[PDB]
Amino acid sequence: LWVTVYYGVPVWKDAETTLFCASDNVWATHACVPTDPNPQEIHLENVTEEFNMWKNNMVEQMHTDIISLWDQSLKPCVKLTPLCVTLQCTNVTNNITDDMRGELKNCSFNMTTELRDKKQKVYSLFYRLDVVQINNKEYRLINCNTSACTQACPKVSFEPIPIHYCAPAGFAILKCKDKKFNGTGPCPSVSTVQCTHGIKPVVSTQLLLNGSLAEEEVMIRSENITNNAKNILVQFNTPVQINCTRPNNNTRKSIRIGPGQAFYATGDIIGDIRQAHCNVSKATWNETLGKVVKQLRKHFGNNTIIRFANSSGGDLEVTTHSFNCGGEFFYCNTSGLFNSTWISNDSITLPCRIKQIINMWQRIGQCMYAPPIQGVIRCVSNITGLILTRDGGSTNSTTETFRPGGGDMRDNWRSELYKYKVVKIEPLGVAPTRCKRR
Amino acid sequence: LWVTVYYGVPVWKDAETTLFCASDNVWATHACVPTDPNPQEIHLENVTEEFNMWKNNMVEQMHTDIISLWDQSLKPCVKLTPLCVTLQCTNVTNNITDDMRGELKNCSFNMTTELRDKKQKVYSLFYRLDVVQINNKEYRLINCNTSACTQACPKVSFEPIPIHYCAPAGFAILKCKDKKFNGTGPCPSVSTVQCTHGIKPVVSTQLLLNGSLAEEEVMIRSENITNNAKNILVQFNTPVQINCTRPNNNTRKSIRIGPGQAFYATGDIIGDIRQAHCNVSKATWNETLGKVVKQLRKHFGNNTIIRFANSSGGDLEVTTHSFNCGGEFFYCNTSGLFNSTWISNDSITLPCRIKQIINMWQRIGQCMYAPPIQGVIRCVSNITGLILTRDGGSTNSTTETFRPGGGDMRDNWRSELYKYKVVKIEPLGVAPTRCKRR
Amino acid sequence: GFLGAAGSTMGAASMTLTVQARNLLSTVWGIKQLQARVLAVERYLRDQQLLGIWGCSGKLICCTNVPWNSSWSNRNLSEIWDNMTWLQWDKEISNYTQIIYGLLEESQNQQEKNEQDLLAL
Amino acid sequence: GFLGAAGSTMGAASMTLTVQARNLLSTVWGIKQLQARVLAVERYLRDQQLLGIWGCSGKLICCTNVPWNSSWSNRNLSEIWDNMTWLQWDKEISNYTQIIYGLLEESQNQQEKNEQDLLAL
Amino acid sequence: GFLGAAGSTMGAASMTLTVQARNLLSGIVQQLTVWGIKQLQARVLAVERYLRDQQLLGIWGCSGKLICCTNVPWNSSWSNRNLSEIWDNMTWLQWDKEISNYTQIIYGLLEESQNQQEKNEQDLLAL
Numbered sequence A, B: 001l002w003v004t005v006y007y008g009v010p011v012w013k014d015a016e017t018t019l020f021c022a023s024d025n026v027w028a029t030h031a032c033v034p035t036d037p038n039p040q041e042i043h044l045e046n047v048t049e050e051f052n053m054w055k056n057n058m059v060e061q062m063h064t065d066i067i068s069l070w071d072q073s074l075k076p077c078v079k080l081t082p083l084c085v086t087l088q089c090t091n092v093t094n095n096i097t098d099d100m101r102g103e104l105k106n107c108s109f110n111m112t113t114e115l116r117d118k119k120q121k122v123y124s125l126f127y128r129l130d131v132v133q134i135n136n137k138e139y140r141l142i143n144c145n146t147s148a149c150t151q152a153c154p155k156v157s158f159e160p161i162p163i164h165y166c167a168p169a170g171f172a173i174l175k176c177k178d179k180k181f182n183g184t185g186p187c188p189s190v191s192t193v194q195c196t197h198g199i200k201p202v203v204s205t206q207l208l209l210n211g212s213l214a215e216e217e218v219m220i221r222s223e224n225i226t227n228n229a230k231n232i233l234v235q236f237n238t239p240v241q242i243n244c245t246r247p248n249n250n251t252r253k254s255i256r257i258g259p260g261q262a263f264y265a266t267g268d269i270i271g272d273i274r275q276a277h278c279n280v281s282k283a284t285w286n287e288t289l290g291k292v293v294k295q296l297r298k299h300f301g302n303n304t305i306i307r308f309a310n311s312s313g314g315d316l317e318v319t320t321h322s323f324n325c326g327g328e329f330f331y332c333n334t335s336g337l338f339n340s341t342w343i344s345n346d347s348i349t350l351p352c353r354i355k356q357i358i359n360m361w362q363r364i365g366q367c368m369y370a371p372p373i374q375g376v377i378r379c380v381s382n383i384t385g386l387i388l389t390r391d392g393g394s395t396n397s398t399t400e401t402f403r404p405g406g407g408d409m410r411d412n413w414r415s416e417l418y419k420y421k422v423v424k425i426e427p428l429g430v431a432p433t434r435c436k437r438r
Numbered sequence C, D: 001g002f003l004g005a006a007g008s009t010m011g012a013a014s015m016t017l018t019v020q021a022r023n024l025l026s027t028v029w030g031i032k033q034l035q036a037r038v039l040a041v042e043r044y045l046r047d048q049q050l051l052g053i054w055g056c057s058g059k060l061i062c063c064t065n066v067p068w069n070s071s072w073s074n075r076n077l078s079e080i081w082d083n084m085t086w087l088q089w090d091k092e093i094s095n096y097t098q099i100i101y102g103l104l105e106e107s108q109n110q111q112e113k114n115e116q117d118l119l120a121l
Numbered sequence E: 001g002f003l004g005a006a007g008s009t010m011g012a013a014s015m016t017l018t019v020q021a022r023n024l025l026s027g028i029v030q031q032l033t034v035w036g037i038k039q040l041q042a043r044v045l046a047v048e049r050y051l052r053d054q055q056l057l058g059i060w061g062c063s064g065k066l067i068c069c070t071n072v073p074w075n076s077s078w079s080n081r082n083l084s085e086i087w088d089n090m091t092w093l094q095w096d097k098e099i100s101n102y103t104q105i106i107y108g109l110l111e112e113s114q115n116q117q118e119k120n121e122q123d124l125l126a127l
Ligand SMILES: *[C@@H]1O[C@H](CO)[C@@H](O[C@@H]2O[C@H](CO)[C@@H](O[C@@H]3O[C@H](CO)[C@@H](O)[C@H](O)[C@@H]3O)[C@H](O)[C@H]2NC(C)=O)[C@H](O)[C@H]1NC(C)=O
Pocket: A310, A311, A312, A313, A319, A333, A335
């Protein structure tokens, strides 16, 4: 009938903190804390927490973390300020096929040398999406009226590496394990964990690549479904293999531009120049689209015809696929993949174009030159998701047209950090039972 | 008698600590924590604290914080190091008035452009106080014999905002509340507070602007009133309004000096050319000077003739009253204010003049280029304190003449931090009693 | 191990208060760890300062003597330690803890009278 | 308030010791404020450790069997607990603190050696 | 001094236990630059270690006491020497090698004994 005061009780409440735990490159795993083997994943009892997917602070903190980490890893590199000269350019004409005609340009310009009184005449191969006519015709680089670039150093590579996320001392991470989870609402499967699973900072804009798989069926997860603006991210049950390759032999030169600074320019091409086909298989794609179109019409309509179309974006990044294949950024058409009108070993090879000057995590005036990679490259990865967007008016609908789109880098990290939330302990608990201290 | 021990007694000693700021531009509060609403204030009653406004250590910490934060705010702007190519300046003389003839110059130099193989011949307008002759005659900027000035990039404004100094844990801030307080000696009524009031870091050299007023009379504060080497400082009871404006209609033009760096030069002036006026009401200033001379003679005698002469500085900053007007820096003659002798709707005008190259905190090799502000500019302010300097001829004399002065910026903020001191609590204590431990 | 005692009854969570308490103190990516450890130290010292001020310090079940009523809950012990958990109990006391925290500010008053006043010869 | 009894009677100032005891815990503005709060934690932990050597962990008011040597203060009890304030009392004793801290430490050292053999029976 | 008589017998260091305890936190005179960040890391690490050891003392109901006893039984498999040759002619240094891999269950036994004693005291004083 008096208070007692208890220390260490299992109450908690929501909070936000700062996090760590790398693995056991630009995503620096040398200045970090190594993880432990065999993490403490303790299965809790009857508690049901209200997990939210769209409001957790961890996604934004991850976004800020990768941004700060990226532009500290680009700091000790070559600043290509002498590269803004006039370029007199001509067509490449070697063994050019029907495509790739004018996509590359043979350019010749002036560039300073170590001894800072003597110049030189060097030549290089820039792409069509990298030079702008100023008006044998003169040319300049596209990024020489906003800011000069920073050439990515060949020593620091930028393949994705696994990391994990701790909670600090006195906090905890609650993990969902329910097999049917629609993003919001409660969950009767809550369990705690110290470091998260193998989260992988992949960069994509239309098709999620090399990520965490689903386990029973394809899961649609979104905001309020009546909205036309909110992304409707789909997670596949089984992966589909993707192969995108560049079948062109490249020669990397070492044009020296200052006292210990090198601009690695693209040389001549050994052999013929072909368009980069960017492949996927028919049968498994058709099967997975069948599974996904079965799991749309559970809550959208009941028998409305579901059709896809190709993307409609303004800039280059939203309207087409964008992904890394080892420092030689691709851009695949993905217009033969969404041309179906579903009612209820051959390939879908894609014209998969390519660009050197990149500007990701879009900020006003911070470009980055990507150096060429010698030889031919090929990547064997797999699609583990979709970033569709519904588009259509009619409430009394007879059809619903889905168009992929994408962008907004934040959403690729809210797709694999959905089963997680950080909480604050607050161990003190007051007024139990009858007592009376002497 | 046997000794007990107490923990948590109210005992404070003098100490040194690093105070943190809080607030509700250059004075960047994006890195400063927000303050609390309605900060508590406790009126201690039976205390006598020995204050000292001339030896407190928070003023030096304020000066260091302002200098370092100013240098932090100067980091993401244009470097402007390649600008000072040999200038050729003519007299601009169009329909200019009779006075201030040959002040502005029409310099015609040529500069590197976005492409690093072309140049462009441009023209700019400069003041006489920014260029010197090097031998139409060739001119060079006054800065790049010592160092290269850094531009103030135009998103950032120079308007002062209030800054509240707090105290960390274990340290208490004691505030003076005696209404007759010359800044030195004991105080009968002391109250504590966690937050200081609104302290704007105003820029002035002779006339303190926008300060905090007195309560009953005009007060006189000094180190040693019989010593003439220390700056005597007076604080007004009622404000006097000042209107400094620049009448000519200048315009700004953008000149590109590289890939992404722009230098803003003064364009052609629309209309006529006139000097910048500065207005102070005559009768109100005469009444205020009467208040000052009435409070001055309590320290020297009832028969001493008091005179005011104009300043006798060596450089420009001590000679002329200097401040900022939202982007432009003024320098005022102020000879028509301090010219009178006192024996026991007309407005005084002052020819305020404009300079652009600013070497502000008196450090060797760092400076400013302030860009011109488009259109006319108007500032309405009010004078709160004066920083006078005695002219002590001989002992037991009958005449004392006072002159304005300053230049040292520590005395500018010493008139706002007089009623504050920092102490460290030591809560341990012992006392004799009758008790025994068992 | 760690807090898998939530969901279980009040009467079963009181025997496991320490394994949830020993895990309370245990260039970018480098400064964040420093801020985290500093923050953990601040929270632990704040909690121990509150226990030290409250008189009962270092004791898990540190039974004091501040009276109840029906206002700061009227639910009897026949249900709140046979069925109900800690998490649900935090919910119904959530806007009532502050005055009880204030009402526990009497240990100083009855240690100046048990030590400073009494035990005098 | 915070320290509103700082000018009152030294006997009456000891009734509210916790409000001083509560608030000892509470890029330019990075390392500086971090160093300030780590120094505050350092000072508080030094204070609590020095109180813990004396056998007064978790106590605001104690007693100890040391005698008061009159060379520290010849003033008796009729002029200390009635009309003076802790500031003048610290100012009088300010260079008599190290020796009484040492005697208090040696008294606790002698006190701690006289129970472990009586508990060995 | 600090680590004074560290090589002495088991009982000789018992009266010199307080000398270590003050100096596990810091000094006062020893309370931007590569020295400063390393000194800050060392200071935070020292505070972390001292607070962890004080918490581990505080769990077993023995806080504020350098010398204490506990009523949990000692299994004979852990050691076999009696009181005669352990408190005399035995320095503290040669004591931790034979009890290296048993300490993690010693801590749990102390924890369970203290929690049972606290629950027993709560049950007894409730009458
Ligand atoms: C999405 O798919 C549509 C349908 O194929 C694509 O539209 C097609 O775009 C191409 C290239 O812009 C058009 O070719 C051009 O057409 C005109 C008219 O014949 C003429 O100037 C040239 O012959 C040239 O080939 C093509 O006609 C057009 N097809 C249709 C049916 O309109 C569209 O480009 C795709 N969008 C994306 C973002 O993938």
